[PDB]
Amino acid sequence: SSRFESLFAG
Amino acid sequence: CQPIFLNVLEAIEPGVVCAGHDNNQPDSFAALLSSLNELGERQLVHVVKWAKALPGFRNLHVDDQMAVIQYSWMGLMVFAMGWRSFTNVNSRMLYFAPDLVFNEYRMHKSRMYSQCVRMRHLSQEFGWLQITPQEFLCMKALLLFSIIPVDGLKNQKFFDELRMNYIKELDRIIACKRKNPTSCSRRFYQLTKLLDSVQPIARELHQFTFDLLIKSHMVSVDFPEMMAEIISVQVPKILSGKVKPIYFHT
Ligand SMILES: C[C@]12CCC(=O)C[C@@H]1CC[C@@H]1[C@@H]2CC[C@]2(C)[C@@H](O)CC[C@@H]12
């Protein structure tokens, strides 16, 4: 999701 | 010949992660679980960096890259913790982090004693089965590709191909010093049984953390925003049967 996606994106 | 695959797995293996727990305070349910949650978030950062560096991981559609991590982090982290417990304290305690080690008293105080004892048993099996560091690395990587949605991934074919390749690598590691096919078969049976055993534990923890998040404000347990997101958006997909583990045995 948003928070995880941001982490994943760097 | 160079063990390219294993060279990579050893090279990308995350280092030590601390929980930030205050061991000077008397143990309490709220503090122990809040620290486990913080540790979960800290380890997730490393799991993401680790996963993205795995051989062939980029072959997967990006949406699937994110999905497999969000579904398998519990199993991955429990497996790694069991290995740490075995190597650092011979399974005498659960070595979540250098600053968060659980003796039986803490297992009880955490209110998930049954799950903790099952994790301690998992840790003991690393010793009973004489799991090598190389088998551990390959098995842990395989755990990232052991849980998928019933409705299918964006590109299920690429995922199936990658999982197959990791199983092939596990076969190669088993055959290294084994010339007899029967010896390899026996080892594969043992390792797949161990891998399967991680799933029921992960599900119990998924259920426990889900219930804890729902009543977190009532028990003073803090959940980092990202963990709250994953546990409320992804974990329920697993608990409701929409996402399921891939078992080797029935
Ligand atoms: C994955 C972690 C944290 C990382 C680890 O070493 C394994 C351990 C297993 C129990 C989890 C914990 C993270 C926080 C959870 C999910 C708590 O909310 C309840 C169960 C805990």
Author numbering:
A (entry chain B): 98 to 107
B (entry chain A): 669 to 918
Show the paper's wording:
Androgen binding to AR leads to activation of genes involved in the development and maintenance of the male reproductive system and other tissues such as bone and muscle. AR is distinguished from other nuclear receptors in that after hormone binding, it preferentially responds to a specialized set of coactivators bearing aromatic-rich motifs, while responding poorly to coactivators bearing the leucine-rich “NR box” motifs favored by other nuclear receptors. Structures of AR in complex with FxxLF, LxxLL, FxxLW, WxxLF, WxxVW, FxxFF, and FxxYF motifs reveal a changing surface of the AR coactivator binding interface that permits accommodation of both AR-specific aromatic-rich motifs and canonical leucine-rich motifs.
The mechanisms that permit AR to accommodate motifs with bulky phenylalanine residues were assessed in a crystal structure of the AR LBD in complex with the FxxLF peptide. The FxxLF peptide recapitulates the binding mode of p160-derived LxxLL motifs to other nuclear receptors. The peptide forms a short α helix whose hydrophobic face, composed of Phe+1, Leu+4, and Phe+5, binds an L-shaped groove formed by helices 3, 4, 5, and 12 of the LBD that is composed of three subsites that accommodate each hydrophobic residue. The conserved charged residues at either end of the cleft, Lys720 and Glu897, the so-called charge clamp residues, make electrostatic interactions with the main chain atoms at the ends of the peptide helix: Lys720 with the carbonyl group of Phe+5, and Glu897 with the amide nitrogens of Phe+1 and Arg−1. Glu897 also interacts with the side chain of Arg−1. The top of the groove, composed of Val716, Lys720, Phe725, Ile737, Val730, Gln733, and Met734, narrows to form the +5 pocket. Met734 and the aliphatic portion of Lys720 constrict this subsite, forming van der Waals interactions with opposite faces of the Phe+5 benzyl ring. The Kd for FxxLF was 1.1 μM, similar to the affinities of physiologically derived FxxLF motifs determined previously by isothermal titration calorimetry.
